[PDB]
Structure 1
Amino acid sequence: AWTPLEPKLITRLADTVRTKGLRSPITMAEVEALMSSPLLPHDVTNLMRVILGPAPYALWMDAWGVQLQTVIAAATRDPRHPANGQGRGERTNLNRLKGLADGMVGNPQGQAALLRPGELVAITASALQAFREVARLAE
């Protein structure tokens, strides 16, 4: 069952990003805090939509896609990925990682249903690395 993040925490994090900036160690610590439980693509996408401005959000979408592509290359380079399965029918496509696959587009409940925990942690680590890249790039 999907539970959304508190809008109070999200508002506090947005104001933190607004006053301290993207690169302060306190901001990265707060992001790591709100990045503790494995989030669904819907959660991370809406979180970055709210806390980041338009141009940093575009940059972050780009960087997140690139990092997820690196993850999928490593996944096709190793059939023992915690997102993959043993047979070929469990291979994870980027539509399933970005939340674009069938039964997931716009629906967080179905998303949480079909996604694997390894998928969730890989998406989360990818999003964190992308946030780091964009923060280092913006300023």
Structure 2
Amino acid sequence: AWTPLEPKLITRLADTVRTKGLRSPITMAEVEALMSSPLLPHDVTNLMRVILGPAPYALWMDAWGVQLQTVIAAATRDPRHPANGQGRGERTNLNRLKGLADGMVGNPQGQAALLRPGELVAITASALQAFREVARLAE
């Protein structure tokens, strides 16, 4: 069952990003805090939509896609990925990682249903690395 993040925590994090900036160690610590439980693509996408401005959000979408593509290359380079399965029918496509696959587009409940925990942690680590890249790039 999907539970959304508190809008109070999200508002506090947005104001933190607004006053301290993207690169302060306190901001990265707060992001790591709100990045503790494995989030669904819907959660991370809306979180970055709210806390980041328009141009940093575009940059972050780009960087997140690139990092997820690196993850999928490593996944096709190793059939023992915690997102993959043993047979070929469990291979994870980027539509399933970005939340674009069938039964997931716009629906967080179905998303949480079909996604694997390894998928969730890989998406989360990818999003964190992308946030780091964009923060280092913006300023």
TM-score relative to the length of structure 2 = 1.00
CA-CA distance at 1:7 after TM superposition? 0.0
Shift of 1:27: 0.0
Q: Does 1:86 align with 2:86?
A: yes
Which consecutive unaligned segments of at least 5 residues does structure 1 have? none
**Where does residue 11 of structure 1 map in the other structure?**
11
Please state how far the C-alpha of 1:100 moved relative to its aligned partner. Answer: 0.0
**1:10: Cα distance to partner?**
0.0
Deviation string, structure 1 residues 81-136 (Cα, Å, up to 9, x no partner):
00000000000000000000000000000000000000000000000000000000
Query: SS of 1:36's equivalent?
Result: coil
TM-score, length-scaled by structure 1: 1.00
CA RMSD of aligned residues (A): 0.0
| Number of residue-to-residue matches in the alignment | 139
Q: Which aligned pairs between 1:1-139 and structure 2 lie closer than 5 A?
A: 1-139=1-139
Runs of 4+ in 1 over 2 A off after TM superposition: none
Q: Aligned partners of 1:68 and 1:10: how far apart in 2?
A: 24
